[PDB]
Design a protein around this ligand. Sequence first.
Ligand SMILES: [K+]
Ligand SMILES: [K+]
Ligand SMILES: [Zn+2]
Ligand SMILES: [Zn+2]
Ligand SMILES: [Zn+2]
Ligand SMILES: [Zn+2]
Lengths: 369, 165, 74, 820, 284
Amino acid sequence: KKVSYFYDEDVGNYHYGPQHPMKPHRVRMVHNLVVNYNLYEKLNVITPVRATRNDMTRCHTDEYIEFLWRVTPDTMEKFQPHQLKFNVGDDCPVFDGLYEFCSISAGGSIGAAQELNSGNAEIAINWAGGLHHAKKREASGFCYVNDIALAALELLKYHQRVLYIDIDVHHGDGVEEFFYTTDRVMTCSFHKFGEYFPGTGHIKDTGIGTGKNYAVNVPLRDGIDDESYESVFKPVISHIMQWFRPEAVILQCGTDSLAGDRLGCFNLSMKGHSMCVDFVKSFNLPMICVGGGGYTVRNVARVWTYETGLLAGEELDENLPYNDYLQYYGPDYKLNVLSNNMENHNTRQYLDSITSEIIENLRNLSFAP
Amino acid sequence: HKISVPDVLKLWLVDDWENITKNQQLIAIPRNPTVRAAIAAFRESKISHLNNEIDVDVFEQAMAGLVIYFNKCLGNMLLYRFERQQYLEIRQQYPDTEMCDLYGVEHLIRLFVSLPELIDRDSQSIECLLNYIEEFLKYLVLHKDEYFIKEYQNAPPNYRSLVGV
Amino acid sequence: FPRLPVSCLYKVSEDGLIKDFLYAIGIEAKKFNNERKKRELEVIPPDVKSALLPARTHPNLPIALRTLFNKART
Amino acid sequence: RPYVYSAFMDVVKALHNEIVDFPGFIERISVILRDYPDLLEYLNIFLPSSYKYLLSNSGANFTLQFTTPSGPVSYVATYNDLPCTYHRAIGFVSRVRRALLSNPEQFFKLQDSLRKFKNSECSLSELQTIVTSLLAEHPSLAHEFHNFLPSSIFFGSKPPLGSFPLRGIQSSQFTLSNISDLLSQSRESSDFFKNVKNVLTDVETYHEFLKLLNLYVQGIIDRNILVSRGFGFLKSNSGLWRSFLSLTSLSPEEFLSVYNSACSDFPECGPSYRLLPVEERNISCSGRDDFAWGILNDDWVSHPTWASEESGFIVQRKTPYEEAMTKLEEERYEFDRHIEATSWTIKSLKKIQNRINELPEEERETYTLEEGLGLPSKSIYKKTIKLVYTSEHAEEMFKALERMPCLTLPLVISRLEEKNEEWKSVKRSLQPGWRSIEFKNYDKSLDSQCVYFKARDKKNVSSKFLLAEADILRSQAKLHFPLRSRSAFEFSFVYDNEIVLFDTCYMVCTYIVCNSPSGLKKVEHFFKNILPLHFGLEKDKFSIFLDQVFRGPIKASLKYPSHPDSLLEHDVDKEQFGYSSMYVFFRLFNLLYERLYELQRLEDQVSIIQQRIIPNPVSQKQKIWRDRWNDLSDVPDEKTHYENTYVMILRLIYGIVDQSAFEDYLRFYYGNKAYKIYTIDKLVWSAAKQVHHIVSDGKYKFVTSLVEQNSSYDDFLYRLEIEKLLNPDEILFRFCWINKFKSFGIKIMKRANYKNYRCPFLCRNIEKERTVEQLVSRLQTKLLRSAELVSGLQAKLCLDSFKLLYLPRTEDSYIDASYL
Amino acid sequence: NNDYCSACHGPGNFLCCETCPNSFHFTCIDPPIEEKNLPDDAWYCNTMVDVWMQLCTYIDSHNPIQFHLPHSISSFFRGVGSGVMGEYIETDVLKRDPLLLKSKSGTPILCFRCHKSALVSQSILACDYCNSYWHPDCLNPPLATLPSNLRKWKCPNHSDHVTPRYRLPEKAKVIRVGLPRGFKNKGNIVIDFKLNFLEQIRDNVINLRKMVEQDEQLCIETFSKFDFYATRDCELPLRILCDVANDNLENDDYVLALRDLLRISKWDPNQPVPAPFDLANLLS
Ligand SMILES: [K+]
Ligand SMILES: [K+]
Ligand SMILES: [Zn+2]
Ligand SMILES: [Zn+2]
Ligand SMILES: [Zn+2]
Ligand SMILES: [Zn+2]
């Protein structure tokens, strides 16, 4: 009955590249607020046991987990053909101290799952790792090791059914591909389908094998506001809880679905993003809330902090205390994050049609022979 | 000069063309019947009409010359660019094997078809050559489960990036 | 000797097509109606496999279910 | 209004046919008759005793009553779903029996007391008082019982917290009656194929339906693909589709279940999954066991696409004021990352030193260490030393660190601290400039429209666009109702607020008085004479209070004007006809009216946009708190904020404020919510450029002079406009006015593009009527009460000699009732 | 040199040539090596079956090329052409603005499904194989974006979405099938004043009164049932709840929910089912 929090202080010091949009810095910023709000006396803070080389191969191939372990930026001509077979090198770059970062993230989320499995935590947080793009045989879109597909397998040891909700702006496609033929992990994802990054995530991609009708994709258009999102989000998740009837949830609370993001298209805000966490929290299931995207670090640092205090059952004031990055937080030094006035493209027609199609697919287990 | 092709073979050739140069699919190169079994299987079926001796000698000469020749064009001009990478790998997994022992008749009809062009440099021999070319074509199409594949293979994900994808 | 599976386009008449369609669909509808009627009278054994096979909309499921749930209950 | 009437009738129909329950009827009606509180108050007579609307403030807030609570109007178009309700009932009784397990008589009294209510022997307010008595200690249960009550049913498209759905939903395809056309349209052998050729009029849409039927015949598709691919062919004929559903013996409760699955696919994996080669499906992951190869997908890959933007994340362009907060953020990050890394390293090396110097003094002198000392994260330690220590000279400093870490340890700790202080010093001296750029770019980064709306709205206010929209609305209504469309009224505007209706005209002539020094003998003649002809104004208070403009009191005071009282007096009360140049004025005028009405309704939340910027005590450490009310010039001193925004628009018009100062004023007060006022100068320029056209141009001056002179006589107007044809080059519209509801209305009537017409008859001869729809009604009742009416006469056209050829023996004969 | 492979006309890492200046992908070259030749390359600068095998051995000295097809096999079917580097393209699918209001033939532009224009939902789509317009929000999969303006689009109302693939010999003709029933195929078929205006006005008036009487009689029968509509449709959830809480196995819609529960926990047919209340401890 105390939200178990996972933080390893060494994480903020890893650096992808010259102007890469990904800054691990932002998990440090969060903790600053979390530590000055007198929050970390209410949480149950735990340093993760780093993940070895033998854990990350429970879902990845040995010639890959054993390539990340040996590549360095200096000796990257002795691995020159290996950074095309494995996709490392230019967009998921080689940086000083890569394998230790992967160990940190993976060990944190595997430890969260282990914490839930024993009756010790009912919620467990890990903002360091929500890397949901990483493939079993290569790296994809700023991710190298798929930590969610390692916490799900460890969750699939005491729980019959497990649900993975994904509110990033991108399609979480590695976690879907890892579980595309099983009726024990249902992967639901609200993403921006179009000419957008992953390229995948059609509404017609809905399972195979024994796990047919067990993958849910909700393709939106750009500019979705905070009320359109709630209309399309609450009924889908209520229907999934009525039909699938999970036993533990993994929520990936990515924050490029927010307004003013250097990579996102949506138009959410801090409350428009927190209503999802608050709604999923209300069902009394063991949850694991992990990080994800988010490339405008002043907004990320404040939203994840609000939600950390939200899950913990505490009320945070709207004024940021004295912290070490206060001058990041703009004029007005408030906790909130506010929306653009950008135009929405999701008509009510679009949202009703796709919601009813999803419910059609979801009902098709007792409504079929 | 011009040879005639069964319209079934035109359909199959154009299907292979689209399947590899557009859909990024591959033929699983180690061929159960190879280019060497598929010439002996034609000789041992055509030898029943080898009555006159000069014709026997010309038939033997043609078959031997053409197998050793198909070995001299499988690296030059019987592959699309998307098929060069898969070449190297096999050339590195089977270092000193003859090519007309791994590739099959999918790659051999490409040589029959492309020979009013290569023949431009003419008393009798060209006609007797093209005759067996035509009879070989219609002898292959009759045996569509002896000399042809049942699927094109999906080019692996790592494979695409190495050629230009 | 095998030849092309599609060698040309064919012109058809609308009325022969329409009579063909009416015949085919009359046959199919006569089939489905007797299938419906025979399903209407099935038993669905009472204590048989839990998590039954039939579709939800089966006129005799809710007596199989009733008798096995009254079995298990006391 | 044909759409509103037809929508009411369809919702009543669907209640009768049982596509819609009482909740669905109530809520769809609430959405249809929202502007008509007279009709809702009338309907309240029929509704049952306990389920009535509760209108307030003339119909600005209504909430239907129920048996236990009242419930406010939301809309999503809910339907009914019984399995969901049974699942909620099962869960709730589960939890309730699990909470009361102690004494087995308070779940007994909840059992034998819902039974009585089921028969009849309790009531909502009688059962609820016992349910609220048993579930007294458990306040989370008694809060879930409130979802099984008559109030949670009505607007229930949103599930509560911790609860399965309440209703079901479906699409509606833009119908004012939120009813899906999968349930409306779908709830002989010569009767079917005769009609299909009438409906499917295009001859290559009919052929494409016969080919669907043919490839059904051949065996390529099954029954379901046929009945689901044919819906999109013949569904806008509720008899054709219902016929087809019986010609194939497919009942409508099954077509619903099979419709979605049977119109397309790359199925059973979807557009982006490929099966791996058999050789790859064996690459080995050494950590999995039995369980994880028999859960993880190994067969199917999907992989990162290109439809032009999908390999790598490379997102679109942003406003030039978000390229300046990204840059600021990057600079701050560079400094902070170097400082924090060097500090981590200092702390770690100090910890190593406080363990090497906690031993007896004889072993300290050579107590050795590995290459990365003991740190599990030696990457940080390596990079900081390579940076501080001149990388070309860092190598030895690694070496010396590992063999004598009792002489070198403090020597390098000191150097790291010195460099750190240098970095912090450089940092503290640039935070001023960071703050000063952040204070500029921040506000117009939550405001994207100050760049894009400037051209979107420029396409909005065109002539070609507004005319094209009138024409397409005419042709869209000429297809839903081929009979009740001659009462068209494409656009119906309601100008109820006169305090905004005075301000619109005020502004449009205040623009002209200053920007163009001509007219004003005709621009005031326009506003004094022509506008009350169309608009039903007092014309004497109006032209009194409208001279606060044409003669001055402005530019030194420039106040908000005084308003008349009752600017509006109290079938069509005034109809006029006019061509396109007047239609465009009536379009721009309503644009401006809607803008100022939005602006006037904004000012109620302006009190919570000003609480988002209340001071932060902790930032009163003398960092920025650069308050925003110091770059604002003199703010006006009127009563409420709408008048001040009005004075600021007048200043922008007069040239005493440029666009930047004006937009900054708007942003301070209304947030990013006032972005359609940003282009309110070119709007008023457009309206004032039209008003300057209804008065000159040598072609429209005559039309307006005629309209004015035959206004002293209704018959003269509509005869000279509609049956005598002075038309120059235009469309013809008829503008109405209904006083009781203050409604305006436009309607196309003709064109003016052939015509050497003189007249058939003598307009003196048919003189009766006042309006023109009354003229048409008189013709109709003269035809219905006729004493004889025969129309045998037919004819034919002569090709390339367009004369009529009346085929012989055919005659026509009418006789009126008074003749005999 | 030239910056395209001398075999396949492709971009990438080229092995260039010093003497005979050309470029090769080095695996599009002669026998592929792998890469890595830094010194000079000089890539190939230098009446019976006897002379024809001398042709065979003479083919060596001519700098490899890609394989394409002869002109007779690629130019044989309908809508098949090569690219620019000799790949297979479809020449029948080649050659956007969201808000269209009137076509250039001066007709309205209204959706085929709901009949409304490109003003209810911001955008409309035009078919290139028909004369029909659609809203992307009305297709059933709903298009989240719009296709490119260089490839043609096809509305839902064609049968090409169900006829599998056949390709036509590009010089075939249309055979007029005179056979008046039972013709087998697989989808390859082509198919073979009063001047009364007063009567029209009277027509319209009487039709309108017909419609008015129709709905006037509809509301008469509907509006008298409100009292039982309201009662049943609003006390439904409490009747469902009274049936579940009393465990009515005769409510044939209760046991169907119980079967959903047996179908969610994936019951094994070997164990006995639990009492209907004890299966409900799946829910909590
Ligand atoms: K799954
Ligand atoms: K997502
Ligand atoms: Zn993302
Ligand atoms: Zn090449
Ligand atoms: Zn539509
Ligand atoms: Zn079309």
